[PDB]
Amino acid sequence: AAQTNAPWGLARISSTSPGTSTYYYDESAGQGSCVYVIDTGIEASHPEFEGRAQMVKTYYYSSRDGNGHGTHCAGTVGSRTYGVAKKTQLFGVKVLDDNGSGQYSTIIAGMDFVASDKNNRNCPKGVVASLSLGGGYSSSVNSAAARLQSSGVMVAVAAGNNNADARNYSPASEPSVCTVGASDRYDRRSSFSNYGSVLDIFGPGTDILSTWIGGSTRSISGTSMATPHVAGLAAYLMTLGKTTAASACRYIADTANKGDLSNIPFGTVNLLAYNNYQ
Numbered sequence: 001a002a003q004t005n006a007p008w009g010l011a012r013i014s015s016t017s018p019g020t021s022t023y024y025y026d027e028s029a030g031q032g033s034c035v036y037v038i039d040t041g042i043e044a045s046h047p048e049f050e051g052r053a054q055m056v057k058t059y060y061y062s063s064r065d066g067n068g069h070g071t072h073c074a075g076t077v078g079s080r081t082y083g084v085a086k087k088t089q090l091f092g093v094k095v096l097d098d099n100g101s102g103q104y105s106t107i108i109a110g111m112d113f114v115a116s117d118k119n120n121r122n123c124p125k126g127v128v129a130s131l132s133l134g135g136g137y138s139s140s141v142n143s144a145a146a147r148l149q150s151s152g153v154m155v156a157v158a159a160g161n162n163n164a165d166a167r168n169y170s171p172a173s174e175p176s177v178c179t180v181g182a183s184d185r186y187d188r189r190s191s192f193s194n195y196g197s198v199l200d201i202f203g204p205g206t207d208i209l210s211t212w213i214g215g216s217t218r219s220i221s222g223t224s225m226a227t228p229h230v231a232g233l234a235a236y237l238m239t240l241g242k243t244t245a246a247s248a249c250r251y252i253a254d255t256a257n258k259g260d261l262s263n264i265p266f267g268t269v270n271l272l273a274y275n276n277y278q
């Protein structure tokens, strides 16, 4: 399948070269997979989700996304126009308040929730979790992310936005999950992207158009935007049977475009997520 005039990031993950605008992908499109977006919520009523998004947990007085960040990330995973995996099921877990903030204890609880809740959901092709959040190093946060991965969920986490080594951020620094840096449309490391040996992969992160609250769209930047490209790609590849939740990060790195990015510090992987479709 071909989506013309797609957001640059979708085109980039289906291309061996920058500077194209069509997204090519197998029509299975992540059908039968599920992606949990652990964030500020998801505006599930947005027409772009077509009934495939659902809030399943909140730790606050409402499950509404009053911020927009979670809705934008969910749109990059799986919205019809702006999403990698256009037939996946999206589940929202609101661990962040409408200012984008949350206690580590709440974030940990949300990760434990996903590890159990996936047993109440029909996801025969596999389960992914997208975590576009983080803060300073916490062994407890890293352990929660490791538990979620171990339970059989492909966990993708943002590297962080401090132009610093991600070894000092969590869950970014947890080795067993997939840590995602950000690139721009000219194949440069995004100026804010964390780096370091803990990174596993880069995805599009600068100037990413996706869904927003109030039934709108907008373009924003961050490793928060690169992460759902990788999460959606994992769901897509798991639906095709190419990989599993346990192996998907390694598979994405093995099949990535290699050596295409500039401004990559010595010791950081030069790998850009790629779907290998055509």
Ligand SMILES: CSCC[C@H](NC(N)=O)C(=O)O
Binding pocket: 005, 006, 007, 008, 009, 011, 020, 021, 207, 209
């Ligand atoms: C009609 S929406 C197209 C959005 C635009 N796409 C590309 N390829 O530049 C962008 O990513 O900004």
